[PDB]
Amino acid sequence: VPKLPCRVDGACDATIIKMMTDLNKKGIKVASVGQNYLISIPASALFADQSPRLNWASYSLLNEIAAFLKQFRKIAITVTSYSSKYVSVKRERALTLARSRVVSEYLWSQGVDSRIIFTQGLGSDKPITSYTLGGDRSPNARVEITFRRAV
Amino acid sequence: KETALSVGAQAGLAWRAKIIDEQLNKQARNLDAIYDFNSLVLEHNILPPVLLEGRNTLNLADAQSIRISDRTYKVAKQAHFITTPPTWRQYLWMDYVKPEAPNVTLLPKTKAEKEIWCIYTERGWKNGIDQANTILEENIARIKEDFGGMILYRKLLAMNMVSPPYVSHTDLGVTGDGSEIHIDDRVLRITALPELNVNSAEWRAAVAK
Amino acid sequence: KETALSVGAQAGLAWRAKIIDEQLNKQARNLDAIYDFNSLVLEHNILPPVLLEGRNTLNLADAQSIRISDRTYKVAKQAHFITTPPTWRQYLWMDYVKPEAPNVTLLPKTKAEKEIWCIYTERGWKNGIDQANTILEENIARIKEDFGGMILYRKLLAMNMVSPPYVSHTDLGVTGDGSEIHIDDRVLRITALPELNVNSAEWRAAVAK
Amino acid sequence: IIKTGDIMFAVLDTSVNSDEPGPILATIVTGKLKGSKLIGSFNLPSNADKMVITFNTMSIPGAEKTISISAYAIDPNTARTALASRTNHHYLMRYGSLFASSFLQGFGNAFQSANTTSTLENAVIGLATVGKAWSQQAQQLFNTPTTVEVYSGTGLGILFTQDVT
Amino acid sequence: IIKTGDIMFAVLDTSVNSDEPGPILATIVTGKLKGSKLIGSFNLPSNADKMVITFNTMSIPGAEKTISISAYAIDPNTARTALASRTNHHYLMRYGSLFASSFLQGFGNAFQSANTTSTLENAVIGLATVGKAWSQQAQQLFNTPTTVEVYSGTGLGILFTQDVT
Amino acid sequence: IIKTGDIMFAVLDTSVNSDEPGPILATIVTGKLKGSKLIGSFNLPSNADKMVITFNTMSIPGAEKTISISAYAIDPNTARTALASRTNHHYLMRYGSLFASSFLQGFGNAFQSANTTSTLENAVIGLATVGKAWSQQAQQLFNTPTTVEVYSGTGLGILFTQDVT
Amino acid sequence: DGCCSKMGGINYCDSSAGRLVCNNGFYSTCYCTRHAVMDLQFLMGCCLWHGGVYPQLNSSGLVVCNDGYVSEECSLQK
């Protein structure tokens, strides 16, 4: 008992709430229901103009989001990408797939203890808003992460 | 030293016992709806037997010696007569007594004495509470096993894998001397106790929709 | 004096054991990745045996008497059944127990006693270090030997120079009395143990490109 | 089975002065033995700087038996063989009685002697004549020892001497 | 069967002085044995610090049998061996007698001696002659101890020494 | 198996004075025997310059046995047979009592004798008469030796005398 | 030490979950019973992966595990 850990290491509820508030006020979407958590990030703040080359400054954001992710004992994590219709379907589908692959690779390099990570990108096949005037600035063009807390 | 430990364990046991007894008494009717017994009771005031079953069993005697079976069925408690159905009191309720024997000899007079007295009393409280929880969980496991055995026997009898119990009634007219008389002698004997069959040919299966 | 020697040796051994165990925990996944056993278990969950090979042996019995051998093969451990594949913990994990015993009453008096205590503790620390390293070396040698024997058996069985083991299995239908029933008796016994063939025609060679 | 020379706790409930030996009982409250009792007696030391009790006749509940483990006691949480009591019981009385008798003798004799160099004579009378009998009786009774007395609410610890079965 | 050295209550009904040997009976008023009685005797201690009672001739009602369990008594709710009695009975008596005898001797002899340096003559006469016989008789009687006496309406507690059936 | 007279270490807990001998227990803290207990006694020397412990009754954990290895003790970090305690217990009290009694006698007698060449008379009285009985009593009691008392938290070393199994 | 710190506060300990509950319906960080999921890698004691420590003690200071293996690192050395 005395040497048994009091709580799960590297976890503080106050820290969790604080950083969740920070992300939400910075605009990155965090959504919670039951124990299933979803995070949304506009692709404009991440990539170039329809290019699968992450901007250098975004590494701080990636560090922050991984730091948040580290507090949850998890099993499976899904990362998917959405985009806008640009030239064809296959073009942006491949673009989304590459972007998801890159972000998944960076996360896997980071110390986020999971068992499974799925990654995919479906271009502009799941619209969420009628407004499609902008290109990479359109809100629907984004990335999203889903997972379910265990126990 | 350990006197505080002992009294704290006693206090924790008693207090947790009182709390759990209060909870049980608070929740009565739904408990009865759960562990009904008279419904399961058969047609001759006879308690059905107790059946257990295990699946995918492997035993290893030593090197080059292994025995594997898929399903096994065992009879734990043989069926018998009864006068009343059982209930939950003997399976869930547990005793209680307020411990009222603190010996006035080891009174903490100094600060360290008070500190150790308090900490030892607290840890005794916690240990007693945990022990009470263990008693409760083993009791509930026992009653669940009993009910499961009963319902499984019912299911197997539906499956037609066990013969029903057999009862012989013998009725005799008035009897006795001129001083003692009984009008109607009714003797109920049990001839055949339920048991498992061996012939697989007549076993009947089932299918839902 | 020698008391300080002994306690310093204990402290050094414990500290080295804790350090090496921590390192082993930190570098874990690759270890189990390389030391698989499930990919080595035989068809019937039977652990393959262990073999040893010797090359170019010589013995001088006495004057006038010499015996040389080209190659020799030994069955170190006979194959036997198994339920779960072995891991590396029971070969490499070290026993760790922090010695918190203040069994020290030869407390220092002067600077000279303090410094001889210091040097005794230093040499005890170093002795613990070397002891732990030697134990680790023995453990790693043992586990390497076992894995080598396993792979040697695999290679020779592929080369068709040893007899593969043979197990006979028998099946029986429903069995038991009216109170106990088993669905499917399945009894498996390894009739033929693995062994080598001292014959010669049965030898097939191998040559790559 | 009890190891040779282990420690047990017990509670003493009856008090007695170190005057007349008698059966004194203690009750074991902790350890393996619960509800057991032990009767014995005390001893009078030559000097009263400490006080100890001999405890030999042990009775354990449960079964009708009487074992004969003999053991002594130490002051709980003090680990000393002395007893907490008072020892200045009968020094002052005898000292004062002797000194007063001597002073009476001296006053009578010296103040009668210095008469060459009525109420004063009567004081001489009383002191000189009542000093001597008082002084000799005080010498006769001076040898009374100062006693000690245990208390009826003091616990104790017992170290064993022999084993049991 | 009675535990080795267990305790019981009893009521003392007949009082006695610690002067002459005599049987004393007590009555058990509780416990398993109810209405039982017990005859025993007393002892005289060297000093009046306590009083203990021998109690062995135990008579149980119902059956005409007599076991001889021997036991002692302690002060109930006091748990001490002291007896409720007075102990300053005959100190000042002999003290004053001896002191007056000595004062008489001194008064007669010294007031006769101081004559050089009829009512006074006869005072000297009586004092100097009747002091001496009184002084020797006081020395003769100084040794009678002060007595203690139990009371007829005090409860008591009896602890056992040996077991019975 | 223990070599014929080698070194062991233990710690004592029960403090005792060299007044009334009795069972004393120590606990072995190191060596092959750990948790072992040793009860024994002490000896009274003619001179209180030291103190040694007669330790014979050894009980080792594990098996219910009682060996009788007898050995003595030496002060750790001192390598001597002395005991760490106080030695000036009872010099000054007897010295002062005797000297004061003698001075009283002298003052009374000399100032009485110096009369030829009332408060001074009373001083003579008290001194010359109370000095003498006090002087003889002090000479009677002047011969009590100085006690030595061990403490409750001192360790010790034991040199063996005989071998065991 | 506040398990539900900067939250609704402690609600109760679910044993079936082996976890504390914050008043805001979010699972806490601490544990409340041994019957929970803790990441356990480092352990104390000796004779591990053997029959454990043999309860019987020997005059010699060596300790041998109940399966017959002797642990030098657990035994004190000369």
Side-chain angles (χ1 to χ4, degrees), chain B residues 89-113:
Chain B
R89 38 91 205 178
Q90 69 286 41
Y91 296 110
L92 290 317
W93 187 272
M94 43 86 53
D95 329 56
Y96 161 76
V97 148
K98 167 63 181 180
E100 293 126 340
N103 195 333
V104 191
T105 52
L106 197 59
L107 291 316
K109 312 304 296 180
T110 196
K111 326 299 150 298
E113 281 175 0

mmCIF file of all heavy atoms in Angstrom, chain B residues 89-113:
data_model
loop_
_atom_site.group_PDB
_atom_site.id
_atom_site.type_symbol
_atom_site.label_atom_id
_atom_site.label_comp_id
_atom_site.label_asym_id
_atom_site.label_seq_id
_atom_site.Cartn_x
_atom_site.Cartn_y
_atom_site.Cartn_z
ATOM 1 N N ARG B 89 -31.832 -13.752 4.180
ATOM 2 C CA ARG B 89 -31.283 -13.400 5.485
ATOM 3 C C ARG B 89 -30.036 -14.213 5.801
ATOM 4 O O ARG B 89 -29.028 -13.665 6.261
ATOM 5 C CB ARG B 89 -32.351 -13.593 6.560
ATOM 6 C CG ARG B 89 -33.244 -14.797 6.337
ATOM 7 C CD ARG B 89 -32.699 -16.034 7.023
ATOM 8 N NE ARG B 89 -33.163 -17.266 6.399
ATOM 9 C CZ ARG B 89 -32.799 -18.482 6.783
ATOM 10 N NH1 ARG B 89 -31.967 -18.666 7.793
ATOM 11 N NH2 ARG B 89 -33.283 -19.539 6.137
ATOM 12 N N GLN B 90 -30.077 -15.513 5.542
ATOM 13 C CA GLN B 90 -28.977 -16.410 5.851
ATOM 14 C C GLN B 90 -27.833 -16.297 4.862
ATOM 15 O O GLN B 90 -26.783 -16.908 5.079
ATOM 16 C CB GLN B 90 -29.478 -17.854 5.884
ATOM 17 C CG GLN B 90 -29.893 -18.405 4.528
ATOM 18 C CD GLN B 90 -31.215 -17.851 4.025
ATOM 19 O OE1 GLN B 90 -31.500 -16.660 4.155
ATOM 20 N NE2 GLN B 90 -32.035 -18.720 3.448
ATOM 21 N N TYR B 91 -28.011 -15.544 3.782
ATOM 22 C CA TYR B 91 -26.973 -15.392 2.782
ATOM 23 C C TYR B 91 -26.398 -13.990 2.697
ATOM 24 O O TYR B 91 -25.298 -13.830 2.159
ATOM 25 C CB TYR B 91 -27.504 -15.792 1.399
ATOM 26 C CG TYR B 91 -27.895 -17.246 1.299
ATOM 27 C CD1 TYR B 91 -29.223 -17.620 1.180
ATOM 28 C CD2 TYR B 91 -26.933 -18.242 1.314
ATOM 29 C CE1 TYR B 91 -29.581 -18.947 1.078
ATOM 30 C CE2 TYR B 91 -27.282 -19.571 1.218
ATOM 31 C CZ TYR B 91 -28.607 -19.917 1.099
ATOM 32 O OH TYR B 91 -28.957 -21.242 1.002
ATOM 33 N N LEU B 92 -27.088 -12.991 3.195
ATOM 34 C CA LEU B 92 -26.590 -11.628 3.080
ATOM 35 C C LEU B 92 -26.475 -10.922 4.418
ATOM 36 O O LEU B 92 -25.501 -10.200 4.641
ATOM 37 C CB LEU B 92 -27.492 -10.810 2.148
ATOM 38 C CG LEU B 92 -27.450 -11.167 0.661
ATOM 39 C CD1 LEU B 92 -26.014 -11.390 0.213
ATOM 40 C CD2 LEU B 92 -28.321 -12.375 0.338
ATOM 41 N N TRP B 93 -27.438 -11.109 5.312
ATOM 42 C CA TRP B 93 -27.377 -10.440 6.601
ATOM 43 C C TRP B 93 -26.198 -10.957 7.409
ATOM 44 O O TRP B 93 -25.828 -12.129 7.320
ATOM 45 C CB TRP B 93 -28.669 -10.651 7.380
ATOM 46 C CG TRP B 93 -28.714 -9.858 8.638
ATOM 47 C CD1 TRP B 93 -28.251 -10.233 9.863
ATOM 48 C CD2 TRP B 93 -29.247 -8.543 8.796
ATOM 49 N NE1 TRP B 93 -28.466 -9.233 10.776
ATOM 50 C CE2 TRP B 93 -29.077 -8.182 10.143
ATOM 51 C CE3 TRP B 93 -29.853 -7.634 7.927
ATOM 52 C CZ2 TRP B 93 -29.492 -6.954 10.642
ATOM 53 C CZ3 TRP B 93 -30.262 -6.417 8.423
ATOM 54 C CH2 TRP B 93 -30.082 -6.087 9.768
ATOM 55 N N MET B 94 -25.606 -10.070 8.198
ATOM 56 C CA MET B 94 -24.497 -10.438 9.060
ATOM 57 C C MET B 94 -24.668 -9.749 10.404
ATOM 58 O O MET B 94 -25.371 -8.744 10.528
ATOM 59 C CB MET B 94 -23.152 -10.091 8.411
ATOM 60 C CG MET B 94 -23.119 -8.737 7.744
ATOM 61 S SD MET B 94 -22.711 -7.456 8.931
ATOM 62 C CE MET B 94 -21.202 -8.141 9.603
ATOM 63 N N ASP B 95 -24.013 -10.310 11.415
ATOM 64 C CA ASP B 95 -24.260 -9.943 12.800
ATOM 65 C C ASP B 95 -23.744 -8.536 13.094
ATOM 66 O O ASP B 95 -23.176 -7.855 12.237
ATOM 67 C CB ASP B 95 -23.602 -10.958 13.726
ATOM 68 C CG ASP B 95 -23.550 -12.342 13.118
ATOM 69 O OD1 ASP B 95 -23.004 -12.482 12.004
ATOM 70 O OD2 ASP B 95 -24.059 -13.288 13.750
ATOM 71 N N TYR B 96 -23.952 -8.101 14.335
ATOM 72 C CA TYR B 96 -23.436 -6.822 14.800
ATOM 73 C C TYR B 96 -23.434 -6.796 16.319
ATOM 74 O O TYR B 96 -24.372 -7.285 16.953
ATOM 75 C CB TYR B 96 -24.260 -5.643 14.278
ATOM 76 C CG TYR B 96 -24.048 -4.388 15.090
ATOM 77 C CD1 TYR B 96 -22.895 -3.632 14.940
ATOM 78 C CD2 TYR B 96 -24.988 -3.969 16.020
ATOM 79 C CE1 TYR B 96 -22.689 -2.491 15.684
ATOM 80 C CE2 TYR B 96 -24.790 -2.829 16.767
ATOM 81 C CZ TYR B 96 -23.639 -2.093 16.595
ATOM 82 O OH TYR B 96 -23.435 -0.954 17.337
ATOM 83 N N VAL B 97 -22.390 -6.200 16.886
ATOM 84 C CA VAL B 97 -22.291 -5.936 18.316
ATOM 85 C C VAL B 97 -21.397 -4.722 18.506
ATOM 86 O O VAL B 97 -20.321 -4.634 17.906
ATOM 87 C CB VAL B 97 -21.739 -7.151 19.093
ATOM 88 C CG1 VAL B 97 -20.921 -6.697 20.293
ATOM 89 C CG2 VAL B 97 -22.871 -8.051 19.550
ATOM 90 N N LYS B 98 -21.841 -3.785 19.330
ATOM 91 C CA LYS B 98 -21.017 -2.624 19.639
ATOM 92 C C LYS B 98 -19.918 -3.029 20.610
ATOM 93 O O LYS B 98 -20.224 -3.483 21.720
ATOM 94 C CB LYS B 98 -21.872 -1.505 20.226
ATOM 95 C CG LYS B 98 -21.084 -0.373 20.875
ATOM 96 C CD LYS B 98 -20.203 0.380 19.891
ATOM 97 C CE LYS B 98 -19.425 1.488 20.595
ATOM 98 N NZ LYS B 98 -18.546 2.259 19.671
ATOM 99 N N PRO B 99 -18.646 -2.896 20.247
ATOM 100 C CA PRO B 99 -17.559 -3.219 21.179
ATOM 101 C C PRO B 99 -17.466 -2.158 22.261
ATOM 102 O O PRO B 99 -17.154 -0.994 21.990
ATOM 103 C CB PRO B 99 -16.316 -3.226 20.274
ATOM 104 C CG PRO B 99 -16.837 -3.246 18.870
ATOM 105 C CD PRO B 99 -18.135 -2.526 18.921
ATOM 106 N N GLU B 100 -17.747 -2.557 23.498
ATOM 107 C CA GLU B 100 -17.768 -1.647 24.636
ATOM 108 C C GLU B 100 -16.800 -2.088 25.728
ATOM 109 O O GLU B 100 -17.135 -2.082 26.913
ATOM 110 C CB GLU B 100 -19.180 -1.524 25.201
ATOM 111 C CG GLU B 100 -20.164 -0.850 24.265
ATOM 112 C CD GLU B 100 -21.405 -1.686 24.027
ATOM 113 O OE1 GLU B 100 -21.350 -2.910 24.264
ATOM 114 O OE2 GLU B 100 -22.436 -1.120 23.606
ATOM 115 N N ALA B 101 -15.588 -2.477 25.343
ATOM 116 C CA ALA B 101 -14.559 -2.894 26.294
ATOM 117 C C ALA B 101 -13.239 -2.196 25.992
ATOM 118 O O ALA B 101 -12.252 -2.843 25.622
ATOM 119 C CB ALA B 101 -14.387 -4.413 26.273
ATOM 120 N N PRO B 102 -13.181 -0.869 26.138
ATOM 121 C CA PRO B 102 -11.877 -0.202 26.113
ATOM 122 C C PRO B 102 -11.266 -0.173 27.502
ATOM 123 O O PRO B 102 -11.818 0.454 28.411
ATOM 124 C CB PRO B 102 -12.215 1.204 25.603
ATOM 125 C CG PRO B 102 -13.685 1.405 25.942
ATOM 126 C CD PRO B 102 -14.261 0.091 26.420
ATOM 127 N N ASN B 103 -10.133 -0.840 27.688
ATOM 128 C CA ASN B 103 -9.514 -0.906 29.005
ATOM 129 C C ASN B 103 -8.834 0.423 29.302
ATOM 130 O O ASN B 103 -8.071 0.932 28.474
ATOM 131 C CB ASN B 103 -8.512 -2.054 29.074
ATOM 132 C CG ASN B 103 -8.111 -2.393 30.497
ATOM 133 O OD1 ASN B 103 -8.140 -1.540 31.385
ATOM 134 N ND2 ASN B 103 -7.737 -3.647 30.722
ATOM 135 N N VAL B 104 -9.094 0.979 30.485
ATOM 136 C CA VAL B 104 -8.512 2.268 30.828
ATOM 137 C C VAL B 104 -7.152 2.013 31.453
ATOM 138 O O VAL B 104 -6.993 2.076 32.677
ATOM 139 C CB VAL B 104 -9.431 3.048 31.786
ATOM 140 C CG1 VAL B 104 -8.968 4.486 31.933
ATOM 141 C CG2 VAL B 104 -10.870 2.989 31.305
ATOM 142 N N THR B 105 -6.174 1.712 30.620
ATOM 143 C CA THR B 105 -4.789 1.586 31.049
ATOM 144 C C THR B 105 -3.815 2.310 30.135
ATOM 145 O O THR B 105 -2.878 2.945 30.625
ATOM 146 C CB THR B 105 -4.410 0.105 31.125
ATOM 147 O OG1 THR B 105 -4.744 -0.533 29.886
ATOM 148 C CG2 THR B 105 -5.155 -0.576 32.258
ATOM 149 N N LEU B 106 -4.013 2.230 28.821
ATOM 150 C CA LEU B 106 -3.101 2.834 27.852
ATOM 151 C C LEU B 106 -3.736 4.116 27.323
ATOM 152 O O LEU B 106 -4.261 4.178 26.213
ATOM 153 C CB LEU B 106 -2.776 1.850 26.732
ATOM 154 C CG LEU B 106 -1.550 2.199 25.884
ATOM 155 C CD1 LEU B 106 -0.310 2.291 26.756
ATOM 156 C CD2 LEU B 106 -1.348 1.182 24.774
ATOM 157 N N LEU B 107 -3.685 5.155 28.146
ATOM 158 C CA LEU B 107 -4.192 6.459 27.751
ATOM 159 C C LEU B 107 -3.038 7.311 27.250
ATOM 160 O O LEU B 107 -2.043 7.468 27.972
ATOM 161 C CB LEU B 107 -4.885 7.149 28.912
ATOM 162 C CG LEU B 107 -6.210 6.539 29.376
ATOM 163 C CD1 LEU B 107 -7.083 6.190 28.179
ATOM 164 C CD2 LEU B 107 -5.986 5.324 30.265
ATOM 165 N N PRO B 108 -3.112 7.863 26.047
ATOM 166 C CA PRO B 108 -1.985 8.651 25.533
ATOM 167 C C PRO B 108 -1.788 9.939 26.311
ATOM 168 O O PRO B 108 -2.588 10.874 26.203
ATOM 169 C CB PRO B 108 -2.383 8.922 24.078
ATOM 170 C CG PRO B 108 -3.868 8.808 24.062
ATOM 171 C CD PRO B 108 -4.209 7.755 25.071
ATOM 172 N N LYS B 109 -0.716 9.996 27.103
ATOM 173 C CA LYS B 109 -0.449 11.154 27.945
ATOM 174 C C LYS B 109 0.437 12.185 27.265
ATOM 175 O O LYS B 109 0.321 13.380 27.562
ATOM 176 C CB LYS B 109 0.201 10.711 29.260
ATOM 177 C CG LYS B 109 -0.501 9.546 29.939
ATOM 178 C CD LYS B 109 -1.967 9.848 30.200
ATOM 179 C CE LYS B 109 -2.135 10.992 31.184
ATOM 180 N NZ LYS B 109 -3.572 11.277 31.445
ATOM 181 N N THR B 110 1.316 11.757 26.365
ATOM 182 C CA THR B 110 2.201 12.663 25.651
ATOM 183 C C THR B 110 1.759 12.805 24.201
ATOM 184 O O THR B 110 0.902 12.068 23.701
ATOM 185 C CB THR B 110 3.654 12.183 25.715
ATOM 186 O OG1 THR B 110 4.525 13.261 25.350
ATOM 187 C CG2 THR B 110 3.876 11.036 24.752
ATOM 188 N N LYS B 111 2.371 13.781 23.529
ATOM 189 C CA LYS B 111 1.983 14.108 22.162
ATOM 190 C C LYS B 111 2.250 12.947 21.216
ATOM 191 O O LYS B 111 1.426 12.643 20.347
ATOM 192 C CB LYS B 111 2.728 15.360 21.699
ATOM 193 C CG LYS B 111 2.975 16.373 22.806
ATOM 194 C CD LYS B 111 1.674 16.889 23.397
ATOM 195 C CE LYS B 111 1.859 17.270 24.855
ATOM 196 N NZ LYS B 111 2.258 16.094 25.682
ATOM 197 N N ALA B 112 3.402 12.289 21.363
ATOM 198 C CA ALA B 112 3.706 11.140 20.517
ATOM 199 C C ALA B 112 2.734 10.000 20.777
ATOM 200 O O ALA B 112 2.314 9.303 19.843
ATOM 201 C CB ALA B 112 5.146 10.684 20.748
ATOM 202 N N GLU B 113 2.373 9.789 22.044
ATOM 203 C CA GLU B 113 1.380 8.775 22.372
ATOM 204 C C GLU B 113 0.057 9.074 21.684
ATOM 205 O O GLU B 113 -0.569 8.183 21.101
ATOM 206 C CB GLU B 113 1.193 8.695 23.886
ATOM 207 C CG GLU B 113 2.275 7.918 24.608
ATOM 208 C CD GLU B 113 2.106 7.959 26.111
ATOM 209 O OE1 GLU B 113 1.143 8.597 26.584
ATOM 210 O OE2 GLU B 113 2.937 7.355 26.820
#
